[PDB]
Amino acid sequence: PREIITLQLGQCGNQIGFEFWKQLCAEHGISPEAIVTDRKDVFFYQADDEHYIPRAVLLDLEPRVIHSILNSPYAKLYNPENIYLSGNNWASGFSQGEKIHEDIFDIIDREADGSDSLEGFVLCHSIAGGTGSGLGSYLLERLNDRYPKKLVQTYSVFPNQSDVVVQPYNSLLTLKRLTQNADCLVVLDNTALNRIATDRLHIQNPSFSQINQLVSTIMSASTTTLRYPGYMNNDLIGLIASLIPTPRLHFLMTGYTPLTTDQSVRKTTVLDVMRRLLQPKNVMVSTGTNHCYIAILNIIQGEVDPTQVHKSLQRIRERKLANFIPWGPASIQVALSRKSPYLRVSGLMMANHTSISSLFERTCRQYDKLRKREAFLEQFRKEDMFKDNFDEMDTSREIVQQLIDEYHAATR
Ligand SMILES: Nc1nc2c(ncn2[C@@H]2O[C@H](COP(=O)(O)OP(=O)(O)OP(O)(O)=S)[C@@H](O)[C@H]2O)c(=O)[nH]1
Numbered sequence: 001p002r003e004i005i006t007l008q009l010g011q012c013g014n015q016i017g018f019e020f021w022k023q024l025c026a027e028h029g030i031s032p033e034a035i036v037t038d039r040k041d042v043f044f045y046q047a048d049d050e051h052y053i054p055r056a057v058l059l060d061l062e063p064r065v066i067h068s069i070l071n072s073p074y075a076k077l078y079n080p081e082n083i084y085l086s087g088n089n090w091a092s093g094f095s096q097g098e099k100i101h102e103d104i105f106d107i108i109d110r111e112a113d114g115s116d117s118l119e120g121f122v123l124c125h126s127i128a129g130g131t132g133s134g135l136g137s138y139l140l141e142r143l144n145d146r147y148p149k150k151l152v153q154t155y156s157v158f159p160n161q162s163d164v165v166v167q168p169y170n171s172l173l174t175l176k177r178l179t180q181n182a183d184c185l186v187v188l189d190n191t192a193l194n195r196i197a198t199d200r201l202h203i204q205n206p207s208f209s210q211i212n213q214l215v216s217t218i219m220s221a222s223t224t225t226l227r228y229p230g231y232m233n234n235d236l237i238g239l240i241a242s243l244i245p246t247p248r249l250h251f252l253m254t255g256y257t258p259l260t261t262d263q264s265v266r267k268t269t270v271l272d273v274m275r276r277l278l279q280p281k282n283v284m285v286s287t288g289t290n291h292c293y294i295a296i297l298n299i300i301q302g303e304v305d306p307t308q309v310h311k312s313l314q315r316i317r318e319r320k321l322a323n324f325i326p327w328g329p330a331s332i333q334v335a336l337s338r339k340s341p342y343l344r345v346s347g348l349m350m351a352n353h354t355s356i357s358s359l360f361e362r363t364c365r366q367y368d369k370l371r372k373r374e375a376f377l378e379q380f381r382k383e384d385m386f387k388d389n390f391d392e393m394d395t396s397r398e399i400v401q402q403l404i405d406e407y408h409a410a411t412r
């Protein structure tokens with residue numbers, strides 16, 4: 001009975017958000033407007049007309065994308081007063097936030113009021129880009145003050161592997177606000193998203209639409225214990241806490257099992273489901289010994305019987321399929337959630353793994369390069385960049401890579 005307000009920034013933020021609500025809607029029997037026991041309250045609000053609307057906030061610096069949603073089959077769903085429209089650069093993005101502060105928080109504070117027990121905020125956005133990273137980083141810094149206790153989680157979209165030129169810039173500046181101004185970071189690697197769409201799906205030119213179909217599934221599954229509540233795992237923090245033992249290190253990777261087909265099989269049990277959630281080919285992140293997990297969560301939908309589950313774990317302990325940390329209790333959690341009373345096993349993984357730092361590394365290597373040449377610094381140094389906050393960020397980020405690597409050490 002805890003609420004979650006969702007912030008959607010920039011094209012990416014709003015296009016994966018579009019898919020997210022399209023999916024939650026199908027599951028809670030809600031139409032592109034309203035209705036036809038699950039907890040709808042967590043993500044939905046009761047309309048003053050016995051109808052339903054999402055606790056969502058569409059924020060963009062360009063009209064193109066929001067008007068796509070508005071001129072679509074889901075225009076009636078969104079709360080009209082929760083949509084806001086005001087530049088390629090993080091700086092430009094961080095800037096326009098301060099300028100639109102009051103207008104933005106009028107919507108955020110109002111939704112915050114409606115809730116009777118607000119747990120926290122979820123921010124959907126991309127790391128590269130201007131809006132997502134810039135306006136995203138600003139909001140992240142403000143939420144950390146206007147609401148000190150409320151938890152903050154994000155589904156952050158990492159670029160593919162350019163054609164923006166300064167992604168490594170926007171990216172570093174944001175990774176900083178994601179390290180200290182965020183409780184939980186579900187990382188969505190566009191590179192890994194592609195490989196899948198392409199391989200385990202056979203699409204030569206995977207579009208964002210297509211790609212966001214995957215993201216929607218993870219976003220959807222990773223919240224099933226909150227929408228189809230049980231005794232344990234009903235708090236968002238009930239999950240995040242079990243996945244993040246120490247702060248800072250809160251960058252999680254995900255993975256899904258039943259990804260394709262329609263061709264039938266002889267038998268699919270929770271066994272091969274958990275076994276697969278451990279094969280890197282299903283892990284939606286791209287990494288390239290020593291590294292290990294810090295925690296692992298497995299959410300299974302459909303029939304199961306918690307006896308079969310004890311058996312799958314054993315086979316794993318003996319087949320050395322999961323390399324956990326060396327400095328402590330190596331354990332994978334299982335949560336048997338239901339599905340919606342509308343259209344076999346299904347599995348979603350959420351792991352806090354060490355090799356996640358690779359992306360942070362892969363970014364600094366790029367930042368550094370472009371930095372050592374004063375590349376494109378002219379467009380950013382066009383607004384309160386008469387010196388360097390870049391240096392502050394890079395160092396912070398190097399800290400994240402230091403502890404994530406420091407975490408695979410038995411010494412830790
Ligand atoms: N998965 C996914 N990634 C997206 C989507 N839209 C953009 N991206 C990825 O996000 C990054 C840029 O996102 P974008 O949506 O341009 O941010 P923006 O802030 O809205 O951009 P701007 O307005 O400053 S130019 C790129 O790495 C791109 O690959 C989307 O709908 N889905």
Ligand SMILES: [Mg+2]
Pocket residue numbers: 010011061062131
């Ligand atoms: Mg945009």
